[PDB]
């Protein structure tokens, strides 16, 4: 985070012990369940790339994921370098140097420069850009660490329909399917993978049935 | 949440780790008991649509319920578009745009626009409007996840009357009864579903008996 | 709660997660023991009717008690309406309870000159309805609190004045019971010692005597 | 507690949920061990009589002690009335205890020139009444604290001065007991060593000698 | 602690429930292990004598140590009176907080020049606590000997833990690396340590016996 | 930490009890796992040398590590003295470590123009000394991390890059081992698949291949 002191100068505020401990415990408890990504975006709110690396470094295990996270950050950093060229004009007084991909990731940039890009006019939100790469790389990890595929989620003979749909849309969240696929799967794979008792009831409802009606029907 | 900084500018303050952890743990412990809904309204006090989505996304399980919650949000968003039409023509620079249904849900609107609408005179409470849609969709989930119907709540032979009334008005809360239906059932289903020993005492009290007198009578 | 922001405007501040969790856990743990009422009044300090309903609604179980609490709130609301006819607008009984009044209106009445403490009025009704619940949920009657043969006198007096608190006896009755029902319901060994002390004996001297 | 708001007006701020929960848990865990009194004085720092009653009312059990505590508060209130006749109004004994005085009046007396600290006066009565409870609830007397044959001297002295704190001994007795009752109640092995040290021995030298 | 209010007036702020509970639990858990002294100095940072006595009084057990702590406070108070004959000038009993109000203590602390009665009194408490830690140390440094199968890392943890409670100088701790640490090692690690020769850091010694 | 008071004067603010307890527990729980170092750099944010010593002194066990940490601090202090002769006074090595410098001087150097970041310089020495400890306390060598017969490849890579982190390998060494030692130490089933992928394979493609 960044704060303006009484002098009007933009200074780096330290990340609190509650936030650091919160981020450590959720990774310890939830590993890489899909809800970890919204929790990371919440705890790292308004953070600099320096603060984002602090939170990533504090994670103890899961170094296979962290090494993959670095590779995704390197790929996004090289993509930034390509389509943002480094202009040959002399650096205007009071304006900062143009942010490079490695500067946004925080490897080759100081904390003062990061505050400079974030607070100057126009602002270059290197914190938000870098967090976009991290969440992007974390989504890939969640997709890989997902144990079951959506095609294998089939309802049991005695399993309640409510529990089956919980597993179905849990798997669909880890596989990071689009929202339209999630809405579409209601009338396609969800009915197909149901047991013969619920499937007969679901087909009788016909097309265009909301999930509310489908769970009421198999109750 | 929103805060007025030292300059007097309305800035978005981070949702605290205490609030986030509180909302996560209540969903883990209480699932979808009726008291979860007041807890959400309390924890999400003064939140932007961005903050409401943060709280909803951090929920780990119950993806069947969350998928139904999305459908109810889409239905309320489309209803907003119907009776508040928006002329989405190109708007002059610096001019607040009229809130669309998807803007209230937070999918197609920035965090700055949401603060703009909320801290306006007169205020356009996109945070409160969106919370109304969420609680509306949450009440439907509680009704569905309610296991027993009010008609099946019958007092046992040796069960104390106090415990039976605890179960009765708990079931009646999940089934989302009106206050008049809850007040009226005191002289209808509560007496009818009582055991023969207490029912004889309750009929002797006659009409117009408060719940206080009924519980004293069967003690 | 209510706060004055930097601008000088009276704004509603959100009830903290600590208070909400504190009030939920004490109802979960203590149910309706007499010490829950002072805990409620303490946690709901300076609250609007909106905040009071939030704390009451967050209670999970005990819906029999909450339904009785509504009836006591409705009875007090009609009594307010009878004593205050309706011609900022003057608060109606349902406005004090928070059913037919906005959060801005409640802040208006509380931060007015002269102030109309709708929060304190409504909390007075809530504590009133909660006291009836504590009396009802009291398991034993004060007449049934009798000291055991091997029970220490200290424990018997702990049970005695605990029951007397749930039955909502007056402070004067509580002071008076020291020489009447407390001595009468004691076991024979301590009762002989208590009568030897005579009239006008403090509880300090009584518990020292049966030690 | 009391706070000066933005306007400069002294307003009552609510006691925090941390403080209330802290005071509840210590009474549940420690009952009436001597350290509960300094814990009470710390948590109730700068409190009004209203806040002191809030903390006292939130205590769940120990109603025998709470009933004795009321009697000590009444006795100190009557002593105040005798030394201070009643003609801002002058605070009477029942006003200091907080039964017959509003929260605004209590703020008036505390934030006055010259200040009448009814909060500190009432806390002095409470701590006085609580010390009587700790003195009574002490299980063993100082004369019965004797060192075992195999008990280490360190543990015996821990028990000795723990009892002496609950028995609310004076500072002089605590210093003096080092050379009298601490040596007298020691076991024959340590007592022989303690007498060899002679007069005027600090507790440091006595515990080093029996190590 | 002390705070400057909105008016600019120095008022005493209440010690927080977190701090009090923190100080109570560390004494319950750690008893009088050497790290309790720095924990006390940190939690009682900027405290008045009134606040220091609040923290000392809240300790439940260990009244033998607390009684010894009182005697050391009395001895240091008499030493202050001998060097300083008698705003009023603070006497020894005023620094300990027995014969001085909370307003006087704030007066001395927020004075020009400041009379740090809080820092002076904390120096006496830490001094008396150091004596307690030295006494409550169970083993002597001479009895800390490495086992036959004990790892060298664990032996050095015990060695310098004992050496901390026995309150050895910083120089004594550094010098013992090649003297008593090697002498009290097992014959397998001792042979390795002597081969390293003089002037070996603790890093090289633990790598050698790994 | 350092704060600017209302007057504009730079004063030292107390290290919070949350921070102190956080740093103590992570050392109790994690000992000297590699993630302890970023946790230390985060908890000691903006701290003076006095505050850094407070955090180091509060550590209870691991005195073997703390004694080695002192030796590394002494070595870096002597290196500072060699590169900076001593003629506000200029900070010497022992002043940066905080042994021979007051808290006011440390604030003087830190809050000055130009700033002499004695807090950041001293923290650089501590993290340097902690990195040496983590390398020593690492149990297994990278050469011994071999995948089992039935072990999933994901778990083997977790162990591999955990060991590689404690040994404080460079980023290039971590990147290079993906196609070198990680493939060599895999089991015969996964190694056959990994060689078939050929050169230039990311870790993502390797873990998908052995799934």
Residue numbers in the entry:
A (entry chain A), B (entry chain F): 1 to 219
C (entry chain E), D (entry chain D), F (entry chain B): 1 to 87, 96 to 219
E (entry chain C): 1 to 86, 96 to 219
Sentences copied from the publication:
HIV capsid has a pivotal role in regulating viral DNA synthesis and shielding viral DNA from cytosolic sensors. Inside the channel, 6 positively charged arginines (R18) are hypothesized to mediate electrostatic nucleotide recruitment to fuel encapsidated DNA synthesis.
To probe the role of CA50 in infectivity, we made HIV-1(M) CA Q50Y, reverting the glutamine to the ancestral tyrosine. Importantly, and unlike other capsid point mutants, for example, CA K25A which prevents IP6 recruitment into assembling virions, HIV-1(M) Q50Y capsids were not intrinsically destabilized, showing WT disassembly kinetics in the absence of IP6 in single-molecule uncoating assays. As expected, given the similar structure, addition of IP6 led to an increase in the HIV-1(M) Q50Y capsid half-life from minutes to hours for the majority of capsids, confirming that IP6 binding was not perturbed. Nevertheless, in infection experiments, single-round infectivity of HIV-1(M) GFP CA Q50Y was reduced and this capsid mutant did not replicate in MDM.
